[PDB]
Amino acid sequence: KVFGRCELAAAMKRHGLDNYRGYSLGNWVCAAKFESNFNTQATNRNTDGSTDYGILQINSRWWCNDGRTPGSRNLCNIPCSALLSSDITASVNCAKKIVSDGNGMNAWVAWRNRCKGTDVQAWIRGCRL
Ligand SMILES: [Cl-]
Ligand SMILES: [N]
Ligand SMILES: [N]
Ligand SMILES: [Pt+2]
Ligand SMILES: [Pt+2]
Ligand SMILES: [Pt+2]
Numbered sequence: 363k364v365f366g367r368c369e370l371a372a373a374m375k376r377h378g379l380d381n382y383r384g385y386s387l388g389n390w391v392c393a394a395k396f397e398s399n400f401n402t403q404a405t406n407r408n409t410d411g412s413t414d415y416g417i418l419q420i421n422s423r424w425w426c427n428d429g430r431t432p433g434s435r436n437l438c439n440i441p442c443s444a445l446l447s448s449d450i451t452a453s454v455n456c457a458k459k460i461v462s463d464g465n466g467m468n469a470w471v472a473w474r475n476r477c478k479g480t481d482v483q484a485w486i487r488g489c490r491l
Contacts, residue, residue, distance in 0.1 A: 363401075363402045363403075363448035364400055365394075365400040365401075365402070365417070365450075366400070367391065367400070367485065367489070368486075368488065368490065368491070370391055370394055370400055370417070370450075371387055371485070371486050371489045371491050372490070373450050374387055374390045374391065374394075374450075374454065377450060377451060377454035377455075378454070379454060379458075382458060382461065383458075383461050383462060383466060385466070385467055386483070387485075387486050388483045388484065388485040388486045389467060389473065389477060389482050390418075390457075391486060392473070392476070392477035392480065392482050392485045393418060393467065393470045393472060393473040393477055395485065396472035396476045396477065397414075397417070397418055397419040397470060397472050397473075398416065400417065401417070402446055402447060402448055402450065402453070403446050404416065405446070408421065408423070411430070411431060413428055413431070415428070415442040415443075415445035415446060416445035416446050416447075416453045417450055417453050418445075418453050418456075418457050418470065420438070420442075420445050420453065420456050420457070420460065422434055422442050423435075424437050424460075425437050425456050425459070426438055426441065426442040426444070426445060427440070427441050427442060428442040438452075438455065438456035438459055440456065
């Protein structure tokens with residue numbers, strides 16, 4: 363599923379991301395925008411051989427099992443394929459653990475480089491929410 367901008371903001375609020383660890387909803391939607399272009403099915407291979415999965419590009423190095431990432435952790439105790447579902451629950455639940463991990467949303471390089479210190483409220487303007 364390629365989510366609409368307001369469509370996704372609504373889902374994220376539902377699953378309890380808005381203001382989660384102090385990050386307003388615009389932060390989560392801007393990150394999904396530059397990580398995956400709102401596509402639940404997005405995968406990208408890292409040079410280290412790990413892969414990034416789903417709407418928030420959660421990395422197989424720490425967070426999920428894909429069975430081809432040598433010496434990796436599965437800290438969200440899930441298969442990476444669960445992060446590709448049209449239902450974003452699994453991706454939200456793992457994001458909560460990542461953004462609690464100490465570095466906040468800086469764990470998403472595209473958030474640090476393209477959303478951090480921007481007018482992120484603009485990502486939720488016009489949305490019934
Ligand atoms: Cl693995
Ligand atoms: N939820
Ligand atoms: N949903
Ligand atoms: Pt957009
Ligand atoms: Pt949902
Ligand atoms: Pt939820």
